[PDB]
Design a protein around this ligand. Sequence first.
Ligand code: A1AA8
Length: 284
Amino acid sequence: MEMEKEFEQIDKSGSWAAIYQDIRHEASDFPSRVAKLPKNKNRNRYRDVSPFDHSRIKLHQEDNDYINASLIKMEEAQRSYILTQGPLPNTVGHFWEMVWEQKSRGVVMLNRVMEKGSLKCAQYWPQKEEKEMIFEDTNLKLTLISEDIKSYYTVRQLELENLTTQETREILHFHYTTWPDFGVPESPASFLNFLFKVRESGSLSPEHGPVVVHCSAGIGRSGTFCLADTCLLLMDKRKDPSSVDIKKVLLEMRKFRMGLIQTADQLRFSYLAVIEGAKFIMGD
Ligand SMILES: CSc1ncccc1C(N)=O
């Protein structure tokens, strides 16, 4: 059913809460036993948000391989994403280890460091060219190369060095800086502009490791970003664009990480973003 009509039918009937609870009821439940080991308590931001054992990203070290991060692998769309929490004071070194080991080109950040007067994630990248960061626990160096500040987002060029081998790589940091403290944006225009900038960079392409995407918990805004991207890509591959079912794509993604899309308002915004985004996809 053309999602634009499904959209007006749910709006006129005011049933967003009912659709959202149906998704919550049908979502997969897989074990997260590694996340809950006592040795990992200070590696989790939130007690109720954990990666499943089957899809978790493993760090390449014998000591403790755990990070709160999941591989979302979308078989038909041919896209992969790593969704992760905002880094904590004791996991900033683990975060950059994962970027290095997974061969990621891009990091997508959908939150501010401070929101609602509380810290939502560590200051995990350098703010000045001449003040680089060293992560002694994982043997990495990170340098700010350049910064481009726009009205809705900032793009940064970073240099990551493996101090063990002296190899270097360029990482692009895409920072969406205008998501409101409460609710969702009124129009999806600036979020879609941002998505198109990440795509144009090469960061989502199969010649690189998966993009790393985060917010505070790595399920709500992070969920909206990957759901919109996958739905738009499927509309371009299929003979019948109207066959793309956003609720079925979301349940497929929830096989790989719990809780993706945190509110009925986030579900409505995801529909809005895909409907507006299609106009350009359909060469219009
Ligand atoms: C208007 S149709 C179209 N336009 C661009 C890319 C893909 C399609 C399609 N058939 O899905």
